[PDB]
Amino acid sequence: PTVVVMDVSLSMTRPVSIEGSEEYQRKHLAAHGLTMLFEHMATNYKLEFTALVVFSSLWELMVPFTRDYNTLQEALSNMDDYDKTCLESALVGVCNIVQQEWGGAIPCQVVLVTDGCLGIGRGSLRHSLATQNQRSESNRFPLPFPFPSKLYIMCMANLEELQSTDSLECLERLIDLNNGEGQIFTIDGPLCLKNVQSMFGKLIDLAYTPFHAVLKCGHLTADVQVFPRPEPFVVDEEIDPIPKVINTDLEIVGFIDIADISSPPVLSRHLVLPIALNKEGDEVGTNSANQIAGKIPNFCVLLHGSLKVEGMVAIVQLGPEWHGMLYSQADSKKKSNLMMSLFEPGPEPLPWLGKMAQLGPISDAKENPYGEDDNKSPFPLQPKNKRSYAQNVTVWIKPSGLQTDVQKILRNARKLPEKTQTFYKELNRLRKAALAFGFLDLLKGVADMLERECTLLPETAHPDAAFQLTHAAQQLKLASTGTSEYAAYDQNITPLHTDFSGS
Amino acid sequence: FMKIFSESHKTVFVVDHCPYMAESCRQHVEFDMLIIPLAPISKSLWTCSVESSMEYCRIMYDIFPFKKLVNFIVSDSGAHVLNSWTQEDQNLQELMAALAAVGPPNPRADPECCSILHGLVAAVETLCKITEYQHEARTLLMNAERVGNRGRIICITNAKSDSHVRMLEDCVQETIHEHNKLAANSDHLMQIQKCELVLIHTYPVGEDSLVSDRSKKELSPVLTSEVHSVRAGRHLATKLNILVQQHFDLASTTITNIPMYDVELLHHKDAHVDFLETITLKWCTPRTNNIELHYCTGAYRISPVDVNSRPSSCLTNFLLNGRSVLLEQPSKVISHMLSSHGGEIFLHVLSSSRSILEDPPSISEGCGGRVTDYRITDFGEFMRENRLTPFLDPRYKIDGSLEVPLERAKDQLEKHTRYWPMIISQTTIFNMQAVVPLASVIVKESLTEEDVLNCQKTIYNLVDMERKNDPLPISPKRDEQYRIMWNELETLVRAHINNSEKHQRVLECLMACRSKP
């Protein structure tokens, strides 16, 4: 998204040229520049959300985030004039309106339009930059922006004017406080409409050029737009320092059911929309143009329609060892169109899928891994070693943890010889854990409890129960000594082979 | 520096096995619940420190199955390294067997030359040994091995006094200094650029601690030391539970409203970066059919603090069975999701804010949006037939440079789309059920003998249809229909004649049977 921060202070009413070369005031060339920007967005960057903030002594959100660039254009008409500037307070508001709408992970571009005349005093920028260190968290400086940001400063004053009053140094200081993310735009010449249009034209080429690509699935192709333009990605500055840009040819390499991809973590999501091109790569002269393109079968429509009906995603090759997925809007009561998510670069972004390079066609398989009735799936891949929650582990730190193990042993002790196998598995489970932790006194205590259970066996009990309880209780005491008997970790307690079953 | 090779890459536990470690922590354990109840029993200091350190390694191994290695050392009359740096030796089951083999400390044993110093020296020496991940990074750079080598030594013992503790620190400092000189002149060792020493003094409950706490102190440009005084038992386990969160940047999440108490999970702190000490998330009632594909900005492995408690067991077993859980922050806001992936439970970070991709352009108003006869059904079958499947062992069909499965999947998509009209009105043969036996196999790399017969039988049937003058779905004259139909079938077959010589014979069969060109 974009937040336009427009200066409406009194200094913006100064003439653009005291020589009378043009009649505009600073605020009029600012409106002309923003008009050029909004008109470009309305035709070549339609989906961008843009808000308009005006600031003087106070700041006001004049237009909240919108794609209606007519209402943004109409906001530049007959703008009121005010007084001093208070740039820091408006930049606080920029932080608020951005996080309040998009959170803190969505890249936003802040376009500050001012003449650099920010004055001296309380709300001045020269004072705010001097008192940057103090106040700590209660009144912290808005820069750097908590969200990924670019701070573009469109100066409605030429380079000679900005340098003559140290105003340029303050504007350059703002970008340095934003980690160099941004750019100052100045005119080293006469302030005029021609040079301001050239200035905003450079902002357009830098920050609002749509990303074109070609979506391919074998011989099925479509010229597409990827919105928003993907941010160049740097993995590890020490190991892999080159910023990664997705391949212009978006090659589909296979398909995976939505249930198998699960909900993978992705870097970003982007809409993939077809564009009408011609011989020179021009986008159809940026209603008759869209009607002609509307009746030409496009692979995006076929792909998106099939992906939604089939509930599937299309794996895309973004580059060497970089992949992503194309899919349809999964909420079925919202509007749906084709979009793309980028995985973390690397050969194994998702463990449950394995190495992307080892994903092949089912034709090369011996049997169809999804089943003849499409009732199975080779996914998810399982990790070679189980985790502690998917496996039996012994934890006796809390007293309730130990009482649970002895109660499971006691319950199965009262159900013999029916539960003989699980009784001896829970018994050896506690035996091994006691030998590992060196908690041999527990073995004596459990053996005493098994002896008590044997004596308290009801007269209506199976005869084998008394034999196995005393056998387990005696073999557990012999393990509590430490002298090599059943004190060895590998030697399990086996039940007595009593002949009570039918001979 | 090195990113993965920070302090947490190498962790070395040093627990003393000396006779005095058999002393009772004097914290009674009630194992018998309800006759005359049995007398409660107490664990030893050695048992308390082995419990707390193994629980430390349980939480780490769940959250970091790779690249976070541990060396477990016990110290008595000598040092005993129970496992190496290899990822294969990062196994709790094998550690328990090794701990059982060394057994408990003998109270009536010779306490001479029995000292924690043995394992402390062994901790310094193993920190200089190369791990598998470090060895692979060395082979890569050949930036010529700027590979960082850092570590952390967690030492649990029962010290005499602060003077005794400072002596342990000075011994570690002098040992790191001297052994780094030996490691520098060795082809298969690495110097210790940074080391954090954590000395944990534990003692039975009811006593007064003979060792006092001391914050982090810089003893050397390499070594930072820090001591802790904590009662054995529950207090000692609570200390290592806090230390595992600091050493690996772990955050805590408490799940409430679990229908069946509350469950606390540990994970990397990045799972709460998007949101903003514990984060409370409410269990959302799982709708029978919710959204299948969630936009996820991050998935982080978890580990339950109370892995065996009934509330946490019910939660984890619910996830392991296959169902997911949506989490809500106290309309409403669903911010996270718990989901198991082949037995491994991840904490998914979801998007709660407004989507910049909301209200997309209409399909109907974009390119090709006014076309009504897209072969959505047929292309849906295309996607099912070109689904990916994992291959584990390297495979081939000839011999030479090995064959990559994903390249073969990409190649199959090329052959399958050499002739694939996107709309119904642009094709005739793909609207005829009689063409299916030929069209489905003619795109194959090589034809089986039964494939050839079915291709010929398809062509023979089309001659029968042309003789009976059956109507065709061409989207005009009957003679003109089959001419167009034969031309289209010829186009499809010629798109694959270079696949094999059998493909060429299928074309010879087509050219001889079709209406005279």
Author numbering:
A (entry chain B): 2 to 287, 297 to 513
B (entry chain A): 0 to 33, 41 to 148, 150 to 267, 279 to 294, 312 to 365, 370 to 514, 523 to 564
Which passages does the manuscript contain on this structure?
To elucidate the molecular basis of their interaction and gain insight into their potential function, we crystallized the INTS13–INTS14 complex and solved its structure to 2.5 Å resolution using a combination of multiple isomorphous replacement (MIR) and native single-wavelength anomalous diffraction (sulfur-SAD). The structure reveals that both proteins share a surprisingly homologous domain organization and form an interlinked, strongly entwined, pseudosymmetric heterodimer. The interface of the INTS13–INTS14 complex is extensive (11,180 Å2) and involves all domains of both proteins. At the center of the complex, the two homologous β-barrel domains form a major contact around a rotational pseudo-symmetry axis. Another large and complex interface is generated by the interdomain linkers of INTS13 and INTS14, which fold onto the surface of the respective opposite β-barrels and also contact the VWA domains. A particularly remarkable and unusual feature of the interface is formed by the linker region of INTS14, which threads through a loop between the first two α-helices (α8, α9) of the α-helical domain of INTS13, thereby generating a physical interlock of the two protein chains. Formation of such an interlinked dimer is difficult to rationalize from already mature, folded proteins, and suggests that in cells INTS13/INTS14 folding and dimerization are coupled. In addition, ~140 residues from the mainly unstructured INTS13 C-terminus are missing from the structure (residues 565–706).
